[PDB]
Each structure stands twice: as C-alpha cells, then as structure tokens.
Amino acid sequence: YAQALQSVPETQVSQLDNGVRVASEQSSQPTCTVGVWIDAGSRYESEKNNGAGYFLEHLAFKGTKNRPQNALEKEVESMGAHLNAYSSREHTAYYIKALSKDVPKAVELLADIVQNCSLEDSQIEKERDVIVRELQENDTSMREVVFNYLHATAFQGTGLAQSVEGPSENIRKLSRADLTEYLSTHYTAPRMVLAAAGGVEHQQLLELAQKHFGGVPFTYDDDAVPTLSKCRFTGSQIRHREDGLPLAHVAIAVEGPGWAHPDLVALQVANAIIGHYDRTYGGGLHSSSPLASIAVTNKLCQSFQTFSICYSETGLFGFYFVCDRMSIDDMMFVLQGQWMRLCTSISESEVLRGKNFLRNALVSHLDGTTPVCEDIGRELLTYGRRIPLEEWEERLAEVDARMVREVCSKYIYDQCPAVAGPGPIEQLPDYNRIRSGMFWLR
Amino acid sequence: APNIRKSHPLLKMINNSLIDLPAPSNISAWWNFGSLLAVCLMTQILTGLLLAMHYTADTSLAFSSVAHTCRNVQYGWLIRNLHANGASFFFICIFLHIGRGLYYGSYLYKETWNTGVILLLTLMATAFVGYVLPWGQMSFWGATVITNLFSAIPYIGHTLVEWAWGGFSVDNPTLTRFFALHFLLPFAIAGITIIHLTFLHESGSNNPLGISSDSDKIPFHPYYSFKDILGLTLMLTPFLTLALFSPNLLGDPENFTPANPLVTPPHIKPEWYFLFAYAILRSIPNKLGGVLALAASVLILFLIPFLHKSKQRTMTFRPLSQTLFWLLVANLLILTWIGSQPVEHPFIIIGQMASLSYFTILLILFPTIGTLENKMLNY
Amino acid sequence: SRWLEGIRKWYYNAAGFNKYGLMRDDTIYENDDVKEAIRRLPENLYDDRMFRIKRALDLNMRQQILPKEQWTKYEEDVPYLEPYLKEVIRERKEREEWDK
Amino acid sequence: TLTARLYSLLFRRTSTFALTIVVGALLFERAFDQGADAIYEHINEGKLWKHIKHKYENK
Numbered sequence: 001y002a003q004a005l006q007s008v009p010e011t012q013v014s015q016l017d018n019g020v021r022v023a024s025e026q027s028s029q030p031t032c033t034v035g036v037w038i039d040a041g042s043r044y045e046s047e048k049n050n051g052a053g054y055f056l057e058h059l060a061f062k063g064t065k066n067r068p069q070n071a072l073e074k075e076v077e078s079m080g081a082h083l084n085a086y087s088s089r090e091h092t093a094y095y096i097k098a099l100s101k102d103v104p105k106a107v108e109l110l111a112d113i114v115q116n117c118s119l120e121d122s123q124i125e126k127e128r129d130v131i132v133r134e135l136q137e138n139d140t141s142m143r144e145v146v147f148n149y150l151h152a153t154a155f156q157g158t159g160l161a162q163s164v165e166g167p168s169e170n171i172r173k174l175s176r177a178d179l180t181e182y183l184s185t186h187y188t189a190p191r192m193v194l195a196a197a198g199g200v201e202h203q204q205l206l207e208l209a210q211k212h213f214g215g216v217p218f219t220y221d222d223d224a225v226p227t228l229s230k231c232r233f234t235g236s237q238i239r240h241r242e243d244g245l246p247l248a249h250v251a252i253a254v255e256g257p258g259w260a261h262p263d264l265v266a267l268q269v270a271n272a273i274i275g276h277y278d279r280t281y282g283g284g285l286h287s288s289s290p291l292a293s294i295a296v297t298n299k300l301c302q303s304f305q306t307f308s309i310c311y312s313e314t315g316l317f318g319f320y321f322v323c324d325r326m327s328i329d330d331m332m333f334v335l336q337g338q339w340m341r342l343c344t345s346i347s348e349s350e351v352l353r354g355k356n357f358l359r360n361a362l363v364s365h366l367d368g369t370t371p372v373c374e375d376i377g378r379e380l381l382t383y384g385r386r387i388p389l390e391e392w393e394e395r396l397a398e399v400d401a402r403m404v405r406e407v408c409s410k411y412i413y414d415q416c417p418a419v420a421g422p423g424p425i426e427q428l429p430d431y432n433r434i435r436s437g438m439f440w441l442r
Numbered sequence: 443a444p445n446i447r448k449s450h451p452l453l454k455m456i457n458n459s460l461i462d463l464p465a466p467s468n469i470s471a472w473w474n475f476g477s478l479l480a481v482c483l484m485t486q487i488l489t490g491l492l493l494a495m496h497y498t499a500d501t502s503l504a505f506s507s508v509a510h511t512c513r514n515v516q517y518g519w520l521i522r523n524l525h526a527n528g529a530s531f532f533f534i535c536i537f538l539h540i541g542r543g544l545y546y547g548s549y550l551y552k553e554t555w556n557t558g559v560i561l562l563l564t565l566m567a568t569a570f571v572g573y574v575l576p577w578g579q580m581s582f583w584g585a586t587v588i589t590n591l592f593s594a595i596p597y598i599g600h601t602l603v604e605w606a607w608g609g610f611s612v613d614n615p616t617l618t619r620f621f622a623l624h625f626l627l628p629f630a631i632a633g634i635t636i637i638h639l640t641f642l643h644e645s646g647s648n649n650p651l652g653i654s655s656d657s658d659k660i661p662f663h664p665y666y667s668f669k670d671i672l673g674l675t676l677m678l679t680p681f682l683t684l685a686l687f688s689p690n691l692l693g694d695p696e697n698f699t700p701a702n703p704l705v706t707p708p709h710i711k712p713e714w715y716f717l718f719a720y721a722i723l724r725s726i727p728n729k730l731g732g733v734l735a736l737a738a739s740v741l742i743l744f745l746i747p748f749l750h751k752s753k754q755r756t757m758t759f760r761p762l763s764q765t766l767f768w769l770l771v772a773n774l775l776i777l778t779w780i781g782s783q784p785v786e787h788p789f790i791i792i793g794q795m796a797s798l799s800y801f802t803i804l805l806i807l808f809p810t811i812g813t814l815e816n817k818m819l820n821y
Numbered sequence: 822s823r824w825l826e827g828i829r830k831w832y833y834n835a836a837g838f839n840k841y842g843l844m845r846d847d848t849i850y851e852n853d854d855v856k857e858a859i860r861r862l863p864e865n866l867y868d869d870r871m872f873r874i875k876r877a878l879d880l881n882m883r884q885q886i887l888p889k890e891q892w893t894k895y896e897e898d899v900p901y902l903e904p905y906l907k908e909v910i911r912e913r914k915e916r917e918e919w920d921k
Numbered sequence: 922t923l924t925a926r927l928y929s930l931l932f933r934r935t936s937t938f939a940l941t942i943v944v945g946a947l948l949f950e951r952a953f954d955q956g957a958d959a960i961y962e963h964i965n966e967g968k969l970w971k972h973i974k975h976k977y978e979n980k
C-alpha cells in the first residue's frame with residue numbers, strides 16, 4: 001500500500017519565461033484530459049463588473065476568430081474530445097479530454113480560447129437571454145441558493161459575497177467590451193496553469209504550450225499577480241422564508257483558514273467524523289457520525305453535508321441540511337451540538353476512522369484523468385505546487401484526537417457563525433440561540 | 443427526543459414557559475409588569491413566611507411580637523421593611539399591569555384577564571389581612587370597617603360578619619383567624635397565577651400593536667428572560683430604596699400606636715393602594731350604596747371586556763379613546779388624592795364627581811368613543 | 822358644515838397607523854369574521870399584508886417608525902379586506918337568521 | 922491586551938469563566954465593602970460609636 005503511494009508517478013512542472021506553469025502526470029492511459037486553470041473568478045469582479053467571468057465561460061466555446069463557431073465545435077466534436085469547464089469565485093478552468101494523441105491539437109485549441117474568443121456581438125446578445133434564463137433555473141435549486149445567500153451574508157460587503165453568476169441587471173447590460181475588459185485583464189499566463197493527465201510525455205506538452213502560448217511579458221506588472229482584497233467575515237444570518245416550499249434548507253458556518261493553512265488537514269478530518277447523511281443510505285446504525293445516526297433515529301433531515309469550502313486567504317467551514325418544515329430545530333440542535341462534542345470530547349477511535357475515510361476520498365478524489373488534472377490544475381494555483389497522495393497521507397496520517405479538538409475548537413468554539421436558510425423555517429430559533437449553541441456548557 | 447429540554451415531563455414545562463416560548467418581538471416594559479408581579483408574590487411569600495417565623499398572633503402579644511421581630515431578630519427589621527413595601531411594589535405593579543392590559547385590550551384574552559381580576563381581588567384581600575396582624579390602631583380599625591363592610595349584604599350580613607371575624611367584635615379570635623388566612627391566601631394567589639398563565643399561553647402574549655404577531659415572534663428565552671432580569675433590577679431599586687432609606691414613607695405612622703378598641707384615630711386614612719375605591723365608598727352616603735359603589739368600583743374590571751367596541755384591539759391608533767384613557771388614569775389618581783382628604787366641600791363634591799366620571803368613563807364614554815372612532819374609518 | 826370627509830381624514834392621520842405604513846384593514850383586530858375574511862384573501866394581498874404587518878412589528882419593536890415619505894396617504898389607503906369581510910358577515914347573519 | 926487576554930484565558934471555557942466569577946466575587950466583596958464602609962463612615966465623622974467609643978477609649 002504505502003508502497004503503492006510511493007510508486008505513484010511524480011508530477012512534472014515547469015513554467016515559461018512567459019509565466020504559465022506547465023505541469024501534469026503520466027500513466028499508460030490512451031486517453032487523457034488537459035486544461036488551463038485561470039486564477040479568475042467572480043471575486044475578481046466589480047459592482048458593475050460582476051457576471052463577466054460567467055457570461056464569458058458561456059462564449060468561451062462558441063468560437064474564436066481563427067476558427068469561428070461551426071468549425072471549433074466541428075473540430076472538437078469530429079475528434080471526439082470533450083471540452084468542458086467552469087468558473088467559481090476564485091477559480092476558473094477549461095479542460096478537454098482526448099486520446100493523448102491530440103496533446104498538441106487540444107493544447108492549441110485551449111490557447112485559442114483563453115486568448116481569442118469570437119465574442120460575436122451577435123452571439124452575446126443571445127447568450128445574454130440564455131443566462132438570464134439559465135439563471136432563473138439556478139434559482140429554484142434551493143440546494144444552491146442557500147449557499148450563495150450563505151456567502152452573501154457570511155462575507156457580506158466584500159467580493160466573495162457576489163455570486164459567481166452575477167445580478168440580472170449586469171447580465172442584462174454587459175457590453176461586448178466589458179467581457180473583453182475581463183479577458184485581457186485576468187486571462188494571463190502567470191495566473192494560468194496548463195495541466196494534464198493520461199499518457200502524455202511532459203516535454204511534448206511543454207513544447208506545444210511553449211509553442212501555442214507565445215505570450216510575451218514586457219513590464220514588471222505583466223509578470224506580477226495581484227493579491228486580493230481581504231474579505232471580512234461577518235457572523236450573521238440571512239433568512240429567505242417561504243412556507244410555500246416543500247422544505248427548508250439551513251447552512252451555518254465559521255470562517256475558514258485558507259488553502260495555505262496546514263490545519264485544513266486536521267480540519268478536513270473533522271468533517272470526516274460527522275460526514276453526511278441522505279435518506280437513501282442504509283444506516284440508522286451508521287458509523288460514529290451520530291449526526292447521521294441521530295438523523296435517522298429521530299428522522300431529523302432529508303440530507304445533511306459537512307463542508308470546508310476554502311479559498312485563497314479565507315474559508316467557510318460549516319454544515320448544510322435539508323429538513324421538513326417541522327424537524328428543523330431538533331436537527332440544528334443535534335447537529336450544532338456535534339460540532340461541540342467534536343471539539344470538546346472527540347476520541348481517538350473516532351479520528352482513526354475519520355482519517356481512513358478521508359484517505360478513501362483522498363484517493364478517489366483522483367479517479368481518472370479529468371479529476372487528476374483538476375488537482376494539478378488546482379494544487380499549483382492555490383497551494384503553489386502539487387501535493388502528492390504520499391504527502392496528503394502523512395499530513396492527515398498524523399492527526400490525533402487531541403489535534404482535532406485543538407483545531408475545531410480553534411475555529412468553532414464561541415465563534416459567531418453565519419447561518420442561511422430559505423424555506424418554511426418558522427421553526428428555526430433566532431440567532432442568539434443558535435449562537436449560544438457554539439459554546440458547550442462544559 | 444435527544445432534546446431532553448422537551449422530553450422531560452417537568453423539565454419541558456420550563457423549556458416551554460421560559461425558553462422556547464413564542465413571544466411577540468415588539469413588547470414594551472408594560473409587559474414586564476407580571477413577571478414583576480411574580481417577584482412580588484415571591485418577595486412577599488418569602489419575606490412573610492420568614493416574618494411569620496416570629497409573629498405571635500394574639501392580641502396581647504401580636505403588636506409587640508412584630509416590634510420584637512424587628513428590634514430583636516437579626517435583619518428582622520429589614521425583613522419587615524421589605525415586606526410592607528413589597529405590598530406596595532406589589533400593588534404598584536398590579537395597578538400598572540392592569541393599566542397596560544386595559545390599554546391594549548389584553549382584556550380580550552378574557553379568561554387570562556378574568557383570572558387576573560381574581561388575583562387583584564385576592565391580592566387586595568390578602569393585603570387587608572396581614573395589615574391587621576401587627577395590630578396597630580390602623581390594623582384594628584381597618585379590621586372593623588372592611589369586615590363590617592359586609593354588614594350591607596342583607597340577611598346573611600350581620601351574621602356573616604359575626605363570623606367573618608371571631609365572635610361579636612374584632613377581638614383576638616378575628617386576629618388569629620386572620621393570620622391564618624394571610625398565611626394561607628398568598629399561596630392561593632400563587633396557584634391562580636399558574637391558572638392565569640395557563641390561560642394565557644393558550645393564546646400567545648398580546649403585543650402593543652394589537653395585530654397578529656405570528657409574523658414575527660421571538661423565543662422567550664434569549665430575549666425576554668434578560669428583559670425580565672433587567673426590569674427586575676429596575677423596579678427593584680425603588681422598592682429597595684424605600685425599604686432602606688424611607689421605609690415608612692408609604693406607611694401611615696398612626697399604625698405605630700398599638701390598637702385601642704375604644705378610640706378610632708381622628709384621621710383614619712386607609713392604605714394608599716386602597717384610597718380610590720375608598721373615596722368612591724364615602725361619597726355615596728348610604729351604607730349599602732357606599733358599599734355597592736365600592737363593590738363595583740373594583741368588580742367592574744370584569745366588564746371591561748364587554749365594554750370593548752373598537753374594531754382594533756389596543757388603542758394606539760385610537761387617539762380619541764386614548765386621551766379618554768388618561769382621563770381615566772388621572773381620574774383615578776384624583777379619586778386617590780380625594781381619598782387621602784378629609785370630608786369638606788372643597789373635596790367631597792370633587793369626590794363624588796370623579797367618583798362618577800370613573801364609572802361613566804368606563805361604562806359609557808369608552809364604548810361610545812369606541813364605536814365612534816370606528817365610524818371615523820367607515821366601520 | 823363640517824365634512825365627515827374632512828373629519829375621517831383627521832382621524833386617519835390622527836390614528837397614525839399609517840406612520841408604521843400599514844393600511845386600515847391591516848389593523849382591525851382579528852376576530853372570527855376577519856379571520857375567515859382574511860382566509861379568503863387572494864394570495865397576492867395576503868403576503869402583501871403579512872410583510873406590512875411584520876414590517877410594522879419590526880418597526881414597533883425598534884420603537885422607530887417609517888420615513889415621512891413611506892407613510893401611506895389617506896386617499897391611497899386600500900380597503901383590501903372590507904369587501905370580503907362584509908360578505909362574510911352577511912353570510913353569517915344569513916345563517917344565524919335561518920337557524921331560527 | 923487585557924480584553925483579549927481575558928476572553929481567551931477567562932471567558933472562553935465555560936469552565937473557567939465561572940471560576941473567575943467566584944474568585945472575582947471574593948475580591949469584589951472584600952474591596953466593595955472596605956470601600957463602602959469607608960465612604961460611609963467618612964461621611965459621618967465623629968458621629969459613630971466607633972468615633973465616640975473613645976470618650977471611654979480616647980479621641
């Protein structure tokens with residue numbers, strides 16, 4: 001096993017005199033996947049600039065000037081490659097997955113987008129009303145709105161608080177320009193990463209990137225990556241009630257450390273211990289995760305999940321559950337209680353499993369090519385380099401009970417959390433109450 | 443239930459009347475009066491229970507006993523002081539509590555209100571006794587009228603009294619049998635108070651706007667618990683201030699002279715928290731009338747719920763009846779003054795007058811200004 | 822000589838329930854009739870009323886009121902419930918009479 | 922920085938907090954009294970028995 005980790009192929013990385021960092025992992029695999037992961041997002045958007053990164057993602061495929069729509073797609077389809085991607089708050093990417101026999105072809109394609117997007121003013125005015133609809137859809141996904149609102153209040157006033165999607169008013173008025181104003185501003189090599197995994201031979205990649213990414217940095221600026229304005233965490237709540245809904249969602253959380261921080265490990269292990277439930281499972285007998293157990297015994301929630309969504313310099317360590325208009329309270333109580341237990345009297349026998357549970361997701365986090373690239377894509381971008389499963393291993397193969405306690409308490413005990421809840425929540429008690437739920441009557 | 447705060451027969455009650463109880467968000471101090479009233483019920487029961495530890499109910503020893511209880515028992519003096527004054531802080535809060543309730547039509551929660559009356563009545567009743575106990579000139583002569591006051595009720599009267607109190611004249615027996623009532627009664631107030639709150643909880647607490655509050659309602663605990671603890675100290679400071687700086691400030695000194703069955707003090711001014719009805723009683727020259735007036739003087743609260751006509755509950759949007767209200771509150775503060783005042787033309791008339799506006803303002807004015815304001819809205 | 826019209830206007834601003842920003846009807850104590858009335862209210866107006874009440878409460882609970890601007894003007898007060906409430910009442914009075 | 926030092930060390934753990942209320946009360950008592958007593962007595966120089974106790978114990 002440990003030998004399995006060790007025998008795992010190191011990841012190659014080397015940047016350009018340009019700025020791009022080119023890394024990737026090699027295997028036997030005929031197939032592969034490759035992508036450019038920009039340090040771009042919504043967080044990087046303004047009050048009138050909010051949306052672009054998206055409105056963008058949405059035209060990032062409809063063509064380039066070199067090869068308009070019908071052709072790009074036709075060139076992509078025709079070769080059997082899958083060009084997919086996203087755009088978060090501090091992370092955007094565009095990956096393709098071909099047969100490795102296309103590294104140089106995929107790579108070019110990549111470059112031709114991140115650099116030259118048609119942005120056909122006529123293509124835009126359509127994607128405009130497309131998003132405005134696609135947004136109206138994102139909307140009844142209470143499973144999400146509940147998170148944005150969480151951000152909305154959790155980081156109220158700052159850049160994170162703005163949703164990756166952006167207000168309707170902006171998407172209704174973004175200019176042919178503003179998009180380009182976004183592209184040319186953030187889409188730069190120093191903040192972009194060319195990563196891939198499959199059967200590829202690094203050098204061949206390099207040269208192709210080093211070949212299609214003929215970027216040239218004059219000024220000292222161009223070679224420098226701006227650090228972002230710190231976002232003020234604001235223990236508070238935001239309630240979008242509506243007893244008209246099947247059920248209510250609740251999401252509460254404390255400020256997260258930020259990728260960098262070594263504790264995100266022990267912390268990650270934390271979330272391992274209470275994990276998540278979801279009525280389909282098969283376990284009123286579940287592992288320690290009482291939140292799970294108790295969730296069953298007393299039919300607390302339809303589903304609950306723990307999360308340590310983190311960013312560059314901040315984060316959101318919490319939990320989110322969905323429950324009938326009626327059992328909302330008992331749930332919080334039982335749940336929030338767990339946090340306490342967690343960082344007041346957690347045991348070794350517990351952390352033991354936690355770890356292994358993480359070590360399982362730790363591994364399965366890297367299941368295939370696309371996913372591997374993700375980490376590489378990410379790793380570098382947010383951490384600085386690539387964290388080997390051999391490393392993560394030790395990182396979290398050395399977290400003892402007393403360490404979890406010391407950690408969670410450090411970020412949960414008597415901290416002012418941010419709660420978010422849409423739906424028939426008449427039953428969720430005020431703040432003070434869920435607030436004094438942060439300290440255990442030890 | 444993993445809760446416990448809800449899975450325990452006893453424990454639930456608490457986490458259901460002090461924690462988790464839904465209370466309107468918007469609530470003025472006038473809502474503390476009650477939680478205070480409790481603290482009085484306590485302060486009274488606690489102190490008095492403790493003062494009874496030294497009382498000696500018996501003519502020849504009764505007066506002195508108390509004196510002893512003061513001069514001799516450590517802090518016994520403090521206990522007394524506190525007690526006699528709790529009496530007042532008690533009547534004050536009650537008098538305000540009734541106010542609030544009157545002017546937010548909390549009297550619409552009928553039962554919770556009717557029980558309330560009972561409490562008042564009893565609190566008036568229990569306070570009547572107890573004051574007899576120290577057996578001072580007042581104690582005695584109050585015993586003799588108030589009791590004899592049931593003289594009015596024909597047939598069953600003269601008899602009911604020569605029974606009310608001991609034999610045929612306020613004497614030792616009446617005293618012992620009063621102590622008993624006093625020692626007992628408070629515990630009744632406590633019980634009924636439970637019944638009072640029960641009825642309440644059936645119907646959430648009111649709220650100053652007089653419109654549904656389900657729209658808001660905050661968890662009693664986090665909020666109002668504190669709010670009570672605060673109001674506790676607020677209207678605790680005065681009461682204490684009195685008890686430590688000018689105790690007898692409210693207490694008639696005339697009662698510092700042991701009872702004399704032979705001479706009722708020229709200048710018999712009843713206890714302040716009683717004056718109003720007192721006035722009403724004397725300004726209606728006729729034993730029966732005198733009493734009757736009185737009877738209804740307090741036993742009228744029972745009708746307020748039926749003398750409600752406003753299409754709106756409270757009267758915060760009823761500027762008309764609103765001032766009529768203070769015309770009442772003042773018409774009361776008046777009767778009071780006129781009560782602490784001997785009977786001569788300068789007064790007397792003033793008396794029976796206010797002692798007329800009183801009724802009317804209630805029986806008639808209110809309900810009239812009531813419907814009227816509704817029509818000034820097309821209702 | 823003195824317009825009931827002129828008067829109502831008085832009382833209206835005098836009651837000053839519009840300072841909290843809620844229509845007349847948003848105040849009428851909720852008795853059996855009104856409840857049934859309001860329970861007949863179109864969901865539009867219901868949620869409207871609700872908020873107006875919750876806002877009212879929230880204000881009241883803060884001791885502060887609504888900017889002179891947001892007060893509702895007498896002539897613009899919307900008797901959103903009077904109509905339903907009335908049917909109700911007569912519906913009842915019709916029944917009450919029939920049961921004799 | 923007092924307040925911070927305080928919270929972390931004294932007010933954080935509900936276990937600790939209480940402990941300082943106690944040890945604190947002991948201190949508040951002792952100090953409040955002496956202070957009160959003094960304030961009081963001083964506002965009554967030569968009137969208290971403690972003050973005349975001496976014309977059969979000098980001053």
Ligand code: HEM
Pocket residue numbers: 483486487488489490491492493494495497508522525526529532565568569571572573574575576624625626627628629631693
């Ligand atoms: C419901 C609240 C109570 C009221 C309204 C009340 C009121 C009074 C009043 C006004 C007196 C006369 C005090 C004076 O001379 O100024 C009194 C005396 C006394 N009360 Fe109460 N009392 C109450 C409850 C109690 C309780 C619970 C006990 C014990 C069962 C008690 C035992 C006594 C005693 C020992 C006296 C005689 C000594 C004295 O006069 O101060 N009282 N009470």
Ligand code: HEM
Pocket residue numbers: 472473474475476477478479480483536539540543546548549550551554555557558559560561562563631635638642647648649743
């Ligand atoms: C025996 C002493 C009494 C106690 C300890 C008591 C207690 C309570 C308490 C605490 C409430 C909760 C809301 C509030 O604080 O106002 C309450 C409500 C009420 N009580 Fe009392 N009460 C007493 C006497 C009375 C009296 C004498 C009246 C009779 C007029 C009365 C009438 C009411 C009314 C109308 C309410 C309900 C409406 C509202 O709370 O807004 N109570 N009382």
Ligand SMILES: CCCCC[C@H]1C(=O)O[C@@H](C)[C@H](NC(=O)c2cccc(NC=O)c2O)C(=O)O[C@H](C)[C@@H]1OC(=O)CC(C)C
Pocket residue numbers: 456459460465469470471473474475476477478480483484631632633635636639647666669670
């Ligand atoms: C073991 C202890 C059990 C607790 C009993 C205790 C319990 O009802 O405690 C509160 C809720 C009660 N008042 C209120 O709830 C309350 C309600 C609406 C608003 C406010 N605040 C205003 O802003 C309140 O304060 C207050 O009036 O005391 C009663 C009445 C009772 O206690 C009395 O029987 C004691 C008598 C019988 C000796």
